[PDB]
């Protein structure tokens, strides 16, 4: 902030992850998560990045004060039954119709839901710790959606290029995001031989 | 400030004049 | 979070009636003092109730002086 | 004075500097026995586990499971470990050079020169020899012929040091085949590793197709052809139920009486949901209630539950099905397409065949043998080998080893040694000396007189025959190209770059603090 | 420590962890002490690093050896509240020169 | 101090920020300050 | 004071005196004593050559020439002063915070005509929003914010799905309404000492207000005396006249530490003191020293009277009750000039 002549370092992401030499080091202007695909099915990479932050899980609502139903006939249970599905083809409809391309959620997932989102070629990202997607929506100029319903067009994240990363030769692997605009956030990520180098 | 050797000398005084008003003393385990 | 002790105390000095029930601000049973703040005394907060009371007030005893001690034993006496 | 909490250390740059030697050379020392084609292999046993042993000849695992408090040790026991998760192998070679680099270091110590230098001027040996590396790497692009060729030479060389050594051709095609069913696909998880007593080692293969160690349900189809084949992880035997955890109140026991009966119809249209798919095989992760299971068995329809999503990823490779979730448009859901499931029993167990698969893209190794750490360490054999194989795949340019090439490197800082000159060319006298070691520590285990031979194979590539290398079958120089003794320039250079590093770090403490262990 | 030629330390956590480092602070952080003062000198690095950073690569030894020099005007029985001004004096010197 | 025959190390482009060396010194001649302000220790016994 | 007072007549202890008679004379002597204290202080409002500050100022000079910042009273006098001009009149120190920020040359340590904060907390967008407001408006929330995190406690019970849905929907209508309450009040700045929903902030970084939650009240406390605004726990009554107003707001690093930032409020009584300093020790001493400095000073804004230190007093006692002794006979004599021979001691 030549403006403020200052920098806060949390806009920094230090990220090292051992393996390959130590040149193999780098910053990237943008963001390196710990995550893979919610789905393994998901495609490895995408060259648009329509994305979308949001915090709400992929789940029946649940308004967290005390609250339980009362089903109490066939058709309670049925249209209960109905919702259920019908409500997952809610969001699903949602977000296809912001027209985004893909996503990501702070927390997990319906497994149904998660097929889903793959059935329209909506890869994402779920379980996704705090700050990083913060990071994520500086780097991205995106917004966090609580919900689907409030979520339009104009919130939703976009990067140059995003493309997991199959790092380890035998690991599991990393989500790295080639933002290629203007950042107030970037990340370093460091390779090297040794935990403690 | 006046107050501040005025209040310490009065109170070292009864301090004495409470410390030199004991003959013995007791103690409880 | 005045004890019972301090609210009996305090509805006499004020000769006005406590009321268990929150609402009915009675006139009759309502307070009525001379003057009442709070005050600084000794680097402790004080609350104050300065009170003429012709009909005769359960008044109150300041003790000044640096040993508590001399204090309990002074309040003996007095 | 007394400074630190009771049972705390300072140790100053000559304890300091020894201890972490010390050690340094036991583990090597510990574990040189173990590389080499005619290396051993060692074995380790729990404290308390009711013997929990591993014969293993992995130094890494080695070192894994071995306890050693000198921290500069942990040091490289960490060092191997991302080695390990590098290549596999060589953590053998890359541990033990490492420590030569250490040894003859202090050596210079005794020669009083300051470390500083001696990170200096091997940072130089070091900058020479990976480039002096580079300069011998060899491609072998679309020529299939030898790029296939070669691919079997790589494998052989990481094979023949392992305990299945004496079938080295067998295993070779395994890996072969089975890396190439990869189709460029890195992961290792696409090869299951089956394990289970009996059998020769020689029995142990790879299916043309896939096996599945799980049970039938009810009695559906026990072998299936042309196979119409479903992945789900939609619970059955978990009830599908709404999260939150709505009650259900009611005053007449009739009201939960069709209930219990609606949540059937519930269950049975799912299903039938499912059928409308006109698949004959279907499969989950999830546990899967057997009424559902009776209705499949009345569709005399086959499926299995409760694969874990390692196999499922493994069923979709195979088959190209898309696990999926609530069905609603089959026309949307591409199915997995087999020619034939059959069940076939193995050793004691029947196992689930999976023939004239459509994807040759997941795969998985019988493994029949004598010993469970037989087993076990045959695993962690092709486990690397593998993992060098993928590596060999995603980079596809090779170099000779059997030592030779290390012995260019030497020779080429052997060279730079002289353009040095200063105190520096003793370190570079020191690095290069360190790295013809090696192939002197291989000839050791293999018993033949090592310091001729090194001499000599110096004296070739001192001429400049890069191809002689030496011999594991009968002891002597040769043409590694006839011989086919070629491995990863990345292995090597993780190799040789590590070490680097290693050295870097090990030299540049001065004092060891440890503090009060709770 | 200090220094481009300087050679760093290794730590040995009570848990049985390592870490090897050069950071003065980390260095301090790390280590066990029982002395009150040296106690003072972590936190002083501490303080002094995520004030500014490296230069803890010698902080301290700006402290000791003044210390260690300041020992030597006792030695003469110069009083240290005397010792304390002057150098204080100097210090404002240093900076205004610098 | 890589033994180059140049002490400028303006030359040799070594540099450093004023206020790295300005606190560091400032600081630590607080630090002394007090270190020598304090004569008596009483130490508990572990 | 005390045991030299107790280290003279010890030898007259040795004699078999009655602790009254000694006791006596020391009633006698410190009245006495006090009052000749009162006939030499010093005031200066009846003079010409004060004002009112410089002779507080000269006190803690005094008073602050002995503890551990001692080469830097002349520094430090100012700002007390000054800010103890700001304490009127309710004249505690409850209001004046210190904050003993680590690291920082001391000299470099600052004191804010206003409020800022040692604290924070990192909740999602927390760093997205801006953090200049030039000149904001400032609400005071003590009500938290956050879809009936810990509210009364309350089962519901609900048939048609519809309703479900319409609930949990009107659940954070609840939320967003306070913050439509928050945003159409038009102020920039909001504080609560409870937690505060992730979310709004975000709302607030979408429509560019700063936030904040978890406050300390006692900071909160300063911060509505600081700025004049009201605390508030209803958002609905809320009105711009309870709404704090400051000259400018910001936040900054220190210490690499996370701080809010806002003075320059004219009518602001409170301020607060960032204390640099880069030992653990020194904050809490300074602070202690800081402590009796404001205390001192504040009892001299309440008395305007004075006296020259260095012992100067004690010795005109000692000498004043000394010719007194010469007056009264006897077994007191002794005691007087004991109490004057003590008395010189410091």
Redesign the interface.
Known sequence: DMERRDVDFELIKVEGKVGGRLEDTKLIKGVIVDKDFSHPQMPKKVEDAKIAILTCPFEPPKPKTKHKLDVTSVEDYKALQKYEKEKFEEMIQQIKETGANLAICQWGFDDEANHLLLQNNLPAVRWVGGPEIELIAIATGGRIVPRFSELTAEKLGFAGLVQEISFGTTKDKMLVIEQCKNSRAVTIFIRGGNKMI | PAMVRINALTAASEAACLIVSVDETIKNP | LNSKWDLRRLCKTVGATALPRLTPPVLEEMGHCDSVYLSEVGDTQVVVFKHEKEDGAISTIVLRGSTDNLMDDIERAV | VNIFKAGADEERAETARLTSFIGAIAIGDLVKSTLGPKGMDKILLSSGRDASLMVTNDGATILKNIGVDNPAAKVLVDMSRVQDDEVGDGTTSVTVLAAELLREAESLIAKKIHPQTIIAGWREATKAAREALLSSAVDHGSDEVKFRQDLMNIAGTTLSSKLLTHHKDHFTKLAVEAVLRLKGSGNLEAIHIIKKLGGSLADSYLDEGFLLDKKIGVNQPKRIENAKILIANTGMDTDKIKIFGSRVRVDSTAKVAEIEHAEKEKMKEKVERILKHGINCFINRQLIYNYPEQLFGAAGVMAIEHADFAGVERLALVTGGEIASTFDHPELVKLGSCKLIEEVMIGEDKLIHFSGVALGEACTIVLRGATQQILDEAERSLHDALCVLAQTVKDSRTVYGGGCSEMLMAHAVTQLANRTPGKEAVAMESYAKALRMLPTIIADNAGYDSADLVAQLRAAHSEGNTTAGLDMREGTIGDMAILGITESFQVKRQVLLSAAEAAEVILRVDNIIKAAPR | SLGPNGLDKMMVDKDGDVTVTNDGATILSMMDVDHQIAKLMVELSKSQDDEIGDGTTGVVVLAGALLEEAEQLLDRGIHPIRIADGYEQAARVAIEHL | ??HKGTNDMKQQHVI?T????????????????????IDD?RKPGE | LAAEFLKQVKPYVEEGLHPQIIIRAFRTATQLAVNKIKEIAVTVKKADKVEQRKLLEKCAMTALSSKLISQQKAFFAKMVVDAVMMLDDLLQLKMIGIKKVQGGALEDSQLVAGVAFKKTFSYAGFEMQPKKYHNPKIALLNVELELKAEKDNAEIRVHTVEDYQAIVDAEWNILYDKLEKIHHSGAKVVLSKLPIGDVATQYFADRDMFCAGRVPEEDLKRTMMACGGSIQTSVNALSADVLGRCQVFEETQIGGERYNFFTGCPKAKTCTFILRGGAEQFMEETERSLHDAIMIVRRAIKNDSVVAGGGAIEMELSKYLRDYSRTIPGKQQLLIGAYAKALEII
């Not at chain 6, 010194?25 to 270190?35: D, E, G, H, K, Y």
């Open positions: 101090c890589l450093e004023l206020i790295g060396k300005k606190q560091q010194i400032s600081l630590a001649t607080q630090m002394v300050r007090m270190i020598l302000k220790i």
